[PDB]
Amino acid sequence: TSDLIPAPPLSKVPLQQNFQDNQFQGKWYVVGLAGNAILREDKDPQKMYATIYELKEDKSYNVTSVLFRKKKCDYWIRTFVPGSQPGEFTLGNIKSYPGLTSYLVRVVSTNYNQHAMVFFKKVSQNREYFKITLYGRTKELTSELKENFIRFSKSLGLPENHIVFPVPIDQCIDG
Numbered sequence: 001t002s003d004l005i006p007a008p009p010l011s012k013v014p015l016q017q018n019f020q021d022n023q024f025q026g027k028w029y030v031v032g033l034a035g036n037a038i039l040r041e042d043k044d045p046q047k048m049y050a051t052i053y054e055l056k057e058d059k060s061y062n063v064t065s066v067l068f069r070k071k072k073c074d075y076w077i078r079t080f081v082p083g084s085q086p087g088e089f090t091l092g093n094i095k096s097y098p099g100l101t102s103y104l105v106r107v108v109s110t111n112y113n114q115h116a117m118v119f120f121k122k123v124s125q126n127r128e129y130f131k132i133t134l135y136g137r138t139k140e141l142t143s144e145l146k147e148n149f150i151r152f153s154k155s156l157g158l159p160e161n162h163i164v165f166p167v168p169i170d171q172c173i174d175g
């Protein structure tokens with residue numbers, strides 16, 4: 001059994017105009033996490049992790065997430081293949097992910113040098129998951145940018161306790 005808030009129609013998820021894939025390269029800090037499978041948990045509040053976007057020759061991203069767990073750095077690697085329009089992506093080598101039938105990425109907004117919002121949607125074991133990452137070039141962002149991320153997360157149907165801001169750490173995500 002699993003109950004999920006439904007994934008929003010793509011109509012409610014903006015696309016960043018004139019997406020410069022080269023300027024989106026590099027390290028982003030996950031300053032905000034929201035989604036139908038994300039839950040606030042004050043026992044072990046979630047530690048901040050980072051995701052690095054590196055373009056290849058074929059303009060796909062090698063996407064490496066690095067995070068700190070069990071006293072070690074875990075490295076989660078996958079490829080984002082360019083999608084229907086610039087700033088939109090799909091997951092490469094989907095068959096290597098057991099249960100995974102669908103994966104969409106959409107860069108909602110960014111200024112490239114400070115902040116970014118990315119929308120993800122996946123269907124795994126037939127369950128439709130979606131999430132929104134508040135990307136920060138640094139570990140801290142303005143309260144306006146954070147409130148806008150709360151604003152946008154709610155516009156897609158998520159309640160407050162499904163919107164989390166991971167606490168900054170220094171292990172692994174530097175550098």
Ligand SMILES: O=C(N[C@@H](CO)C(=O)O)c1cccc(O)c1O
Nearest residue numbers: 035037038120121122129130131
């Ligand atoms: O909600 C997600 N994942 C949770 C459970 O699958 C998680 O926290 O791992 C989730 C949703 C869209 C895309 C993803 O990469 C993703 O991990």
Ligand SMILES: O=C(O)c1cccc(O)c1O
Nearest residue numbers: 049051064065066067076
């Ligand atoms: O499980 C996670 O926390 C996670 C981290 C980075 C990237 C992902 O897709 C994840 O599901």
Ligand SMILES: O=C(O)c1cccc(O)c1O
Nearest residue numbers: 078097098100103122124
């Ligand atoms: O949990 C996973 O293994 C997973 C698989 C495919 C894509 C993801 O984002 C994942 O977190």
Ligand code: NA
Nearest residue numbers: 030051065133
């Ligand atoms: Na991420």
